[PDB]
Ligand binder design. Structure first.
Ligand SMILES: CCCCCCCCCCCCCCCCCC(=O)OC[C@H](COP(=O)([O-])OCC(O)COP(=O)([O-])OC[C@@H](COC(=O)CCCCCCCCCCCCCCCCC)OC(=O)CCCCCCCCCCCCCCCCC)OC(=O)CCCCCCCCCCCCCCCCC
Ligand SMILES: CCCCCCCCCCCCCCCCCC(=O)OC[C@H](COP(=O)([O-])OCC(O)COP(=O)([O-])OC[C@@H](COC(=O)CCCCCCCCCCCCCCCCC)OC(=O)CCCCCCCCCCCCCCCCC)OC(=O)CCCCCCCCCCCCCCCCC
Ligand SMILES: CCCCCCCCCCCCCCCCCC(=O)OC[C@H](COP(=O)([O-])OCC(O)COP(=O)([O-])OC[C@@H](COC(=O)CCCCCCCCCCCCCCCCC)OC(=O)CCCCCCCCCCCCCCCCC)OC(=O)CCCCCCCCCCCCCCCCC
Ligand SMILES: CC(C)=CCC/C(C)=C/CC/C(C)=C\CC/C(C)=C/CC/C(C)=C/CC/C(C)=C/CC/C(C)=C/CC/C(C)=C\CC/C(C)=C/CC1=C(C)C(=O)c2ccccc2C1=O
Ligand SMILES: CCCCCCCC/C=C\CCCCCCCC(=O)OC[C@H](COP(=O)(O)OCCN)OC(=O)CCCCCCCCCCCCCCC
Ligand SMILES: CCCCCCCC/C=C\CCCCCCCC(=O)OC[C@H](COP(=O)(O)OCCN)OC(=O)CCCCCCCCCCCCCCC
Ligand code: HEM
Ligand code: HEM
Ligand SMILES: CCc1nc2ccc(Cl)cn2c1C(=O)NCc1ccc(C2CC3(C2)CN(S(=O)(=O)C(F)(F)F)C3)cc1
Ligand SMILES: CCCCCCCCCCCCCCCC(=O)O
Lengths: 143, 534, 139, 185, 74
């Protein structure tokens, strides 16, 4: 349902509001490492000529199949590399599309998972995501 | 009569010299029609004027430093000790019918020569016309700029008046004298002794009417021969490739255009020589070494030199009983400029590593670094030129002269950097504007409201459009894109009649249909040729 | 546009009362008689508001009601093409620079600079007014 | 036709502002006339109404021809609009030359800006009106060229109409200036 | 070397200048402004202007170098 103050306009677009002083975006991470991750995603995706994506959320059973499910929402799933991390289930799954095949990602993905988990074991989620995106983007090469 | 006569003359010419193949090859030479490719023409045409009027001036000028008493018509100078050269310059001004007009046309043509060479150099630099195989032609052009500068300098110094004598003393004498080891030797070789010599005006006259014009004529001939036989460059466009030249043939369109531009340039120069006073040397007086005026400035193309002398902060060195004056810096300054002007194509080749054969020009927006560099150079030149004029600027636009000097000193470092930054960003922004027009199409300016209240500006796609509607993104091909819908044939046919009374609607219909069909035919021909070569 | 003309009519009435009251109140009781300075400004302020309001009333009397002026109307009433709006232009900055050149010439009283500034103003206004009417270059 | 033409309303609003500028000029003129001491126009100036009436009539008839040009333009007759606007331009230029002749006649006698307060206010007010007339002539030339550049659309007619508005405002301000300077004195 | 996302027509002309050249040029220009302080002039307002411009140039150079060091500029 629509939350408090949300309206479906005549153009179909949704018009939401925020309580005075509250936040439209309240990700549980600092702005600086969010900027770092955004830069890593943008420049790694430009360097590998393939869109990169990071997912944080539950995966349920068969984390592989869940990551297959969620990569459909990437704007260009075929040219995409999605790193899905379920921190409560402690699961990591890299999923890469048909266009990104044999492009250096075959070795990068296990190395990406290794970097992610290695940085994770200290307790830094965003740092691990940044490291995994960086190493995967280094591994993948433009078509 | 004048048909059989032309046929007979052609037959005789072809039997004696058989030039038909070569002449036809010259008549069918294609020349691109861009307006900027006319800039060089200006520098040529004014030069021709400088020759003609110049020859006229040689019929009355006497290049002597011998002292005389004026004894002429101009009363404010009668009984005044002057030189024979200054006396004959006054005689040209006052005693010869049309002498003042020819003098003013000649000096205005010298100014037009310098300014047109600068604008042509700007075009060549920013469009990348200096690249391979056209580097030697850039070197020739740079030598021509230097020679023209020194030619104008030696020219306005020929009438030995107070202003030009001050200019000779300051630049030709002080800087030459101050140089190390061979400086005074150079000064005494050139002046034949100390500065107020006797063989200076004749020497400059022989350098100025014969020597430098001869060298300039040889270099201009080589320049134009190179342009003729290394065919002209062109901008990217519809039928334009690295292997063709698209435009008009020499006969008759190009010849008529060039002759008419020559006529109109001569007309501009004549109007200026009539209606604007340049170098009124009777007001300046003859040159005496003991007296000077406040507004001591050379012609504009030399002002930067003097400006570079004004702003450099009095740095001198005294090694082991010798002196290296401040003026040495000025000389080095000049040399650096000249050197960096002559070697630029090779410097850019060494930096970018690009040694490819080029015939399609670059738009200045597509080369942001070089455009920023040239903007830096132009800004520094303009700052030096206006620093030369800071005394008049401070007298008219009330400012402390010391304040102007310090503004120049800080500026000749700060302003080039600011100009580089702004020009680089501006060029990239122009590229982004072109990209937006390719992605979305020409913005028409019409805005409409949808039934749900969405304001949308009508866009005009420049190519194919997808199934429902959105431009199919074109690819930039290095050519200008329309950005106003008026430039496309939107609303462009008023009544065909005179300015005050119309013609019958049938003639209007016929002329409009003819225009429409001719434009369609031209577009179709260009498109078929472009497809054929692709 | 009844309300616009009504606003300007109200302003015109008040300004006419102010001007006439000032003229009467200073013709008597003021040292020099009619002040001749405030009175002129108030009278022509009445003239300004009168011109604007009277023109708006001529517009509104021959105008059928627009959506904007009609309460309880739908957005769909306003559908269609609005007029023309310039998407971009670099002529305004040149016009302002030309006016500034002329103003600097007139401040320092340099007649040549005033003439050059007016020439630049005319050229840049020509560019602005002609911007969206120059047809294709005919070759 | 169920909308207001906002070029027209903008021109009306700006013309009101220009009327306020001329209000400032009138405020200059009326003061220093209350300081005349029974001589206004004070000697040695002599207001030559004989040359001033013809130029006023020329300006008024030029407004008439401008309105004729508007009538031509509103029905899409670009050529009639051009004819009547060339007439208006020629007649306004005649007014400018008549005002120049009046100026040179007054100056030769000794009525100048640095001479007297009367010459001051007179030259200031009439010279700014002449500047407005020169601006109107420039507008006429620009509009005629613009009509020459493109098919005569309704926007062309709108521009011609607002230029005529400006001319009407100029002729009215001149009528006020005449009635104040040469009749009320 | 540069990509076409920052400079669209980077394939058409020289569109990248090494950052070291601009950094070194800024520092050299600030040094030149500082050097112009010693001279044959008796005034000292120009000294304040020279110091201020050298300070702003050095501040810009240091800011750019620092931000490129931390990856805030890539
Ligand atoms: C300004 C005032 C100064 C004067 C200069 C004005 C302009 C100078 C040259 C501009 C071009 C003018 C047109 C032209 O020269 O065409 C030559 C043209 C040559 O024909 P072509 O077959 O097209 O070119 C031959 C090459 O093989 C073509 O082969 P290619 O295309 O493969 O090129 C090979 C080569 C060939 O380059 C050349 O041909 C050099 C020609 C130099 C001529 C100058 O080209 C180059 O190497 C490029 C660089 C050339 C460097 C030359 C510069 C040296 C300095 C010259 C000093 C200037 C003084 O000759 C004519 O057509 C003249 C016929 C007209 C005769 C009229 C009837 C006779 C009546 C006689 C009766 C007496 C009355
Ligand atoms: C009276 C006034 C009253 C009001 C009037 C109106 C006032 C207007 C309102 C003003 C308010 C405006 C505020 C809005 C700003 C505009 C919006 C905006 O985008 O700003 C965002 C903007 C974003 O900042 P950002 O991250 O730095 O963005 C810049 C790029 O990312 C980084 O750029 P990049 O990545 O491209 O880096 C390359 C280089 C960009 O390139 C350059 O600009 C340097 C070019 C040097 C010359 C190149 C030579 C080329 C080789 C030719 C050979 C000859 C040498 O940039 C730099 O490295 C900067 C340092 C370079 C300075 C060099 C200057 C001296 C060099 C001179 C050597 C040449 C002399 C030769 C001849 C001299 C002897 C004859 O935020 C700011 O506004 C910055 C404020 C921070 C200032 C604090 C630091 C300074 C502290 C106090 C000073
Ligand atoms: C004609 C122009 C007039 C306007 C000039 C503006 C004047 C304002 C400057 C006044 C003081 C600024 C305070 C700077 C403290 C930095 C604090 C900080 O950010 O710490 C975190 C930061 C730690 O890095 P981070 O945690 O990774 O930052 C992450 C963010 O993304 C970091 O990224 P971010 O970019 O977002 O933040 C960086 C931060 C720092 O960026 C920098 O690193 C450069 C700071 C250099 C300024 C230091 C003063 C020297 C200026 C000389 C001026 C002479 C007068 O931003 C600033 O630049 C400071 C704010 C000033 C910007 C100007 C705002 C313009 C808008 C308003 C228009 C007009 C305002 C003027 C009046 C303002 C008051 C009404 O610390 C630093 O980075 C600073 C160290 C890096 C070296 C800086 C360059 C050294 C400059 C000193 C040499 C100068 C020689 C002495 C001259 C003596 C003169 C007599
Ligand atoms: C484009 C370029 C400079 C390439 C050179 C490459 C390069 C990096 C060289 C090194 C630069 C170095 C070391 C020193 C710079 C000093 C230098 C180059 C001196 C040599 C002379 C020279 C070649 C100067 C550059 C040529 C130049 C500035 C041409 C003018 C630019 C153009 C295209 C102007 C067109 C606009 C036009 C026709 C009219 C606009 C009207 C105005 C306001 C023009 C500006 C203007 C000018 C340009 C005057 O010369 C001038 C002289 C005296 C009084 C006033 C003025 C004045 O107002
Ligand atoms: C500013 C205010 C403008 C007012 C318009 C009035 C123009 C017409 C006034 C006619 C002048 C006249 O007739 O006055 C006779 C005196 C002779 O006086 P004299 O020598 O002592 O004695 C006789 C010995 N020969 O000429 C003069 O002052 C010459 C003054 C002429 C002023 C020209 C105005 C230029 C327009 C300025 C544009 C400003 C634009 C601003 C840009 C933002
Ligand atoms: C209180 C604080 C005051 C601060 C004062 C000064 C600022 C200090 C830093 C100022 C920096 C001084 C050292 C320096 O300039 O070196 C580095 C650059 C960029 O290299 P980067 O490693 O990629 O920078 C990104 C990391 N950010 O230049 C180079 O590496 C050299 C490149 C080679 C260019 C050749 C030089 C040609 C000379 C041209 C002359 C015109
Ligand atoms: C007296 C001096 C000069 C004269 C008479 C002159 C004349 C000309 C003419 C007529 C052209 C062909 C038409 C055009 O491109 O405009 C040309 C082209 C050229 N000029 Fe100059 N110019 C002079 C100075 C310079 C300078 C200072 C440079 C630098 C230069 C470099 C070039 C180059 C590289 C070309 C070939 C451009 C192309 O083929 O498209 N010239 N010159
Ligand atoms: C690029 C070519 C030339 C340039 C830039 C140039 C420039 C000038 C200038 C600026 C003057 C000063 C005129 C004055 O103040 O009265 C001058 C004087 C003179 N020029 Fe030239 N000139 C050129 C070619 C020639 C040629 C080819 C001749 C002869 C055939 C010539 C003959 C003279 C003479 C005799 C004077 C001195 C007479 C006088 O000053 O009235 N010049 N020159
Ligand atoms: C400081 C330049 C200058 N101030 C004034 C003051 C008043 C006036 Cl009315 C003119 N000016 C000028 C001037 O007219 N500037 C143009 C100029 C002409 C010739 C030269 C000289 C420079 C060389 C010829 C001399 N050398 S050289 O290589 O060492 C040697 F010894 F000749 F070989 C370079 C330099 C500038
Ligand atoms: C009064 C001040 C000067 C104004 C002069 C403006 C003249 C420039 C306009 C040129 C008109 C050209 C129209 C032809 C178009 C076709 O197509």
């Amino acid at each position: 349902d629509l939350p408090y103050g949300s309206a479906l306009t005549s153009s179909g677009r949704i018009s939401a509001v925020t309580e005075p002083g509250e936040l439209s975006v309240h990700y549980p991470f600092p702005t600086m490492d969010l900027v770092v991750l955004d830069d890593a995603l943008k420049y790694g995706s430009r360097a590998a000529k393939a869109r990169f994506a990071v997912y944080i959320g539950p995966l349920g059973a068969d984390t592989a199949a869940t990551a297959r499910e969620i990569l459909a929402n990437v704007p260009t799933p075929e040219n995409a590399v999605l790193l899905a991390v379920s921190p409560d289930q402690r699961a990591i799954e890299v999923v890469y599309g048909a266009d990104v095949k044999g492009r250096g990602i075959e070795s990068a993905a296990p190395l990406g998972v290794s970097a992610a988990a290695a940085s994770f074991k200290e307790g830094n989620l965003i740092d691990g995501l940044i490291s995994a995106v960086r190493v995967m983007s280094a591994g993948v090469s433009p078509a | 009569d004048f048909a059989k006569l032309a046929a007979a003359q052609g037959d005789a010419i072809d039997s004696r010299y058989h030039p038909s193949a070569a002449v036809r090859r010259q008549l069918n030479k294609v020349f691109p029609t861009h307006w900027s490719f006319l800039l060089g023409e200006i520098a040529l045409y004014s030069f021709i004027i400088l020759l003609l009027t110049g020859v006229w001036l040689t019929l009355f000028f006497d290049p002597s430093m011998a002292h005389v008493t004026y004894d002429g018509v101009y009363q404010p100078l009668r009984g005044v000790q002057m030189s024979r050269a200054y006396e004959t310059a006054l005689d040209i001004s006052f005693e010869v019918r049309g002498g003042l007009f020819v003098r003013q046309v000649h000096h205005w043509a010298a100014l037009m020569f310098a300014a047109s060479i600068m604008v042509h150099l700007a075009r060549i630099f920013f469009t990348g016309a200096f690249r391979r195989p056209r580097e030697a032609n850039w070197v020739i052009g740079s030598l021509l700029l230097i020679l023209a500068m020194f030619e104008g300098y030696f020219g306005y110094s020929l009438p030995d008046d107070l202003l030009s004598g001050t200019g000779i003393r300051a630049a030709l004498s002080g800087i030459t004298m101050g140089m190390p080891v061979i400086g005074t030797w150079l000064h005494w070789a050139l002046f034949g002794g100390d500065f107020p010599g006797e063989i200076l005006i004749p020497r400059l006259y022989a350098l100025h009417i014969l020597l430098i014009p001869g060298i300039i004529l040889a270099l201009i001939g080589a320049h134009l021969a190179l342009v003729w036989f290394q065919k002209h460059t062109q901008f990217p466009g519809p039928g334009r490739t690295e292997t063709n030249v698209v435009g008009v043939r020499v006969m008759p369109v190009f010849a008529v255009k060039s002759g008419a531009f020559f006529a109109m340039i001569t007309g501009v120069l004549g109007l200026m020589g009539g209606l604007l006073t340049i170098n009124p040397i009777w007001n300046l007086g003859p040159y005496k070494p003991s007296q000077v005026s406040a507004g001591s400035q050379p012609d504009f193309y030399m002002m930067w030199t003097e400006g570079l002398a004004r702003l450099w902060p009095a740095w001198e060195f005294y090694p082991f009983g010798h002196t290296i004056p401040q003026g040495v810096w000025v000389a080095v300054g000049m040399g650096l400029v000249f050197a960096l002007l002559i070697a630029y194509p090779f410097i850019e080749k060494k930096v970018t590593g690009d040694d490819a054969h080029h015939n399609l020009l670059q738009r200045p927006r597509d080369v942001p670094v070089r455009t920023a560099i040239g903007s830096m150079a132009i800004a520094l030149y303009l700052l030096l030129t206006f620093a030369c004029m800071n005394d008049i600027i401070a007298l008219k636009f009330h400012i402390s002269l010391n304040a102007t000097t310090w503004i120049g000193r800080i500026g000749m470092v700060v302003l080039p950097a600011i100009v580089y930054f702004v020009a680089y960003r501006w060029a990239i922004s122009l590229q982004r504007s072109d990209r937006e027009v390719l992605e979305h199409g020409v913005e028409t300016g019409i805005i409409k409201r949808l039934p749900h209240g969405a304001y949308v500006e009508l866009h005009q796609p420049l190519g194919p459009v997808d199934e429902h509607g959105h431009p199919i993104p074109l690819e930039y091909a290095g050519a200008p894109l329309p950005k106003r819908m008026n430039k496309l044939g939107s609303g462009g046919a008023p009544g065909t009649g005179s300015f005050l009374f119309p013609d019958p609607a049938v003639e209007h219909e016929a002329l409009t249909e003819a225009a429409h069909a001719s434009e369609h035919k031209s577009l179709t021909a260009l498109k078929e040729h472009q497809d054929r070569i692709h | 546009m009844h309300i616009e003309a009504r606003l300007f009519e109200i302003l015109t009435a008040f300004f006419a009362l102010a001007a006439v009251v000032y003229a009467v109140l200073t013709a008597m009781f003021a040292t020099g008689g009619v002040e001749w300075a405030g009175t002129t400004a108030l009278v022509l302020t009445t003239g300004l508001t009168l011109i604007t309001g009277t023109f708006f009333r001529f517009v509104a009397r021959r105008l059928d009601t627009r959506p904007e002026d009609y309460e309880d109307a739908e957005i769909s009433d306003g559908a269609g093409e609005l007029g023309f709006f310039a998407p971009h232009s670099w002529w305004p900055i040149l016009i302002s620079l030309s006016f500034s050149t002329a103003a600097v010439g007139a401040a320092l009283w340099l007649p040549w600079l005033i003439a050059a500034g007016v020439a630049f103003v005319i050229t840049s206004v020509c560019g602005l007014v002609f911007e969206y009417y120059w047809g294709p270059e005919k070759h | 036709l169920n909308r207001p033409n906002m070029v027209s309303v903008g021109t009306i609003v700006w013309l009101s502002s220009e009327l306020m500028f001329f209000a400032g000029l009138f405020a200059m003129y009326f003061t220093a006339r209350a300081q005349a001491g029974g001589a206004w126009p004070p000697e040695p100036t002599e207001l030559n109404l004989a040359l001033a009436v013809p130029v006023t009539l020329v300006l008024i008839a030029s407004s008439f021809t401008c309105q004729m040009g508007v009538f031509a333009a509103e029905r899409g007759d670009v050529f009639g609009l051009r004819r009547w606007y060339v007439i208006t331009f020629l007649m306004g230029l005649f007014f400018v030359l008549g005002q120049g002749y009046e100026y040179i006649h007054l100056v030769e006698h000794g009525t100048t800006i640095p001479g007297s307060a009367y010459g001051s206010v007179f030259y200031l007010a009439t010279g700014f009106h002449g500047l407005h007339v020169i601006g109107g002539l420039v507008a006429f030339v620009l509009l005629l060229a613009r009509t020459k550049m493109s098919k005569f659309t309704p926007a062309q007619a709108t521009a011609a109409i607002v230029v005529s508005y400006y001319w009407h405002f100029v002729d009215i301000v001149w009528i006020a200036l005449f009635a104040t300077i040469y009749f009320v004195r | 070397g540069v990509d076409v996302e920052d400079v669209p027509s980077a394939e058409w002309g020289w569109s990248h200048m090494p950052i070291g050249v601009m950094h070194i040029g800024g520092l050299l220009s600030a040094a030149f402004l500082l050097v112009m302080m010693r001279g044959n002039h008796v005034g000292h307002v120009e000294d304040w202007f020279l110091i201020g411009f050298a300070a702003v140039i050095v501040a810009l150079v240091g800011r750019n170098w620092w931000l490129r060091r931390r990856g805030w500029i890539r």
